[PDB]
């Protein structure tokens, strides 16, 4: 039924892929956790890791096989993955209160949450002997051309996938399974283009999509924006931060700002894209010596999430972002990394498309942009723990 289907797949796998799958079957948790946060290190750090080979073999084995139609998958998810820190119900309780249901409902009202790791799923709804570790059950519809690896584990045909998308929850209801209340969510995948570590692919895509962008620029404003981004971007941003047009109005810098905005507005981004930026404490209203900047202790992260997660954002100046997610020596101290999803059609441009040292895979966004923070999560970077913020740009 599925035993010969699992066989026909494993037969055509490599011996290295087979031993990688076995090592996953033995120590799945650590491998999944590593795959979640693997792309936020240095270029050479991710190369010398003693677990990168396993990740590469597993991702190749998964992506070898793809599906041709959308289909639904079923799994249990921890409710804190959707930025709900409270408990829906304890593991021994049997009933879910209406207040908890409502709190979970307005927690996930209009948001997108990103999933970036290996996962073990099922193609059939949970039954009787199936493990039910969380009070949240997910009905997710996968898109076409997504990879699944059906492997037998102690007879049970299990399925393994890798997540590279962001999901949104449409409707939630309360159901009963074996005398226990569960929250059942219907979710859908929102496709996006994400170059995590392979900056080569992102650079090639940006070149192909924005090397002709300069041609559409009128030459005077082209040289004007070019001279800005070489020498005067710091001055323009500093003038914008101090609310210069309102406090000390002057047309000399307002002309530069208008030219930059128009040039960025000329050609928008054609596809949903994700960019990574390392943010400083002054952006969040903190100082380098503030005690809360130390994320080793739990209370600092808890307070930061309580005061920032789910709220809005506003950057009067321009935002400098890079396609890649690897750590750079220019912002090594920055403990806060910002993950931004760019909706299709939003203003922006690939600065590094033009020849010369335009930056490090630089992508610029229009000033005055607003952001919404969906979820905030933490990962350990050597002897210190850095903090990851997931956000969506709104028009």
């Amino acid at each position: 039924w599925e035993r010969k289907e699992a066989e026909r797949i494993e037969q055509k796998l490599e011996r290295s892929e087979k031993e990688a799958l076995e090592s996953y079957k033995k120590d799945s948790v650590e491998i999944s956790k590593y795959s979640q946060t693997r792309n936020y290190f240095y270029d050479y750090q991710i190369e010398a890791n003693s677990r990168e080979k396993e990740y590469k073999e597993l991702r190749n084995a998964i992506s070898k096989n793809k599906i041709d139609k959308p289909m639904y998958v079923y799994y249990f998810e921890s409710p804190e993955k959707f930025a709900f820190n409270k408990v829906i119900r304890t593991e021994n309780q049997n009933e879910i209160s209406l207040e908890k249901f409502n709190e979970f409902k307005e927690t996930i009202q209009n948001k997108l949450f990103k999933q970036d790791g290996f996962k073990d799923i099922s193609l059939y709804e949970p039954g009787k002997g199936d493990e039910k570790p969380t009070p949240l059950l997910m009905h997710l519809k996968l898109p076409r051309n997504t990879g699944m690896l059906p492997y037998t584990n102690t007879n049970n045909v299990s399925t393994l996938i890798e997540q590279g998308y962001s999901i949104k929850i449409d409707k939630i209801v309360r159901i009963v399974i074996d005398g226990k209340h569960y929250i059942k969510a219907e979710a859908s995948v929102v496709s996006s283009l994400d170059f995590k570590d392979d900056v080569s692919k992102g650079d090639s895509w940006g070149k192909a999509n924005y090397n002709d962008w300069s041609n559409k620029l009128t030459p005077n404003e082209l040289a004007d924006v070019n001279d800005y981004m070489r020498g005067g971007y710091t001055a323009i941003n500093n003038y914008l931060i101090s609310n210069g047009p309102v406090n000390n109005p002057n047309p000399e810098l307002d002309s530069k700002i208008t030219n930059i905005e128009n040039a960025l507005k000329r050609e928008p981004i054609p596809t949903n894209l994700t960019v990574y930026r390392r943010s400083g404490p002054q952006e969040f209203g903190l100082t380098l010596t503030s005690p809360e900047y130390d994320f080793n202790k739990l209370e600092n992260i808890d307070a930061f999430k309580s005061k920032w997660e789910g709220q809005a954002l506003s950057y009067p100046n321009f935002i400098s972002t890079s396609i890649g997610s690897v750590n750079m020596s220019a912002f090594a101290k920055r403990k806060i990394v910002l993950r931004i999803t760019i909706p299709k059609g939003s203003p922006g441009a690939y600065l590094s498309a033009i020849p010369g040292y335009a930056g490090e895979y630089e992508v610029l966004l229009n000033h005055g942009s607003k952001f919404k923070i969906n979820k905030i999560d933490s990962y350990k970077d050597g002897t210190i723990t850095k903090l990851i913020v997931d956000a969506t740009l709104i028009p």
């Binding site: 709804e125 949970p126 039954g127 009787k128 399974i177």
Partner: protein, 209 residues
Amino acid sequence: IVGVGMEKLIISTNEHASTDQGKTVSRATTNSKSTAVQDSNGESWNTGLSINKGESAYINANVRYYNTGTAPMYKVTPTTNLVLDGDTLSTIKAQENQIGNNLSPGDTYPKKGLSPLALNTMDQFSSRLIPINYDQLKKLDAGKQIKLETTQVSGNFGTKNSSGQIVTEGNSWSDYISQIDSISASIILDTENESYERRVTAKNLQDPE
């Protein structure tokens, strides 16, 4: 609680009978030294009767199944004894011809209003009949009767998932019979037109746990 009741039994004597008849015509001529002519004709008849002592007859029993429990049995496969005087002639497990798909409590297979089913083969693929001896056939001819005893029954039960999908294959009642009978007390109510048999769990006072 499933049992089998035999309603009637049929004997099929296994004998070979033959019958012949012939005709002959002859002629003779003698020349001694005198001549003579002889004309002859005749006929004959014959009958025969051959019997095997190893298998002198075959038997066929009409039976029904009944359930007096609280749960249905699926794929009912009883095992029965056939006893003539003090000898168990044979023990047959029901083949695929004599399997009842459903048997609800208080019901009967075949259902009420239908004729009993015939149990007349003993091998696994229903290709061999039930034989008896010459002595057993003589005992039957003298007025002795054959009794039917049920020794065990095999059957399934249904397990339902969250979407109401009933599965019975691989769920065997025999896995639970010993465990249920070990920790229970049996109570029977007989009434007049129907019987009921139950098991109720009883406490063990020698175990503190």
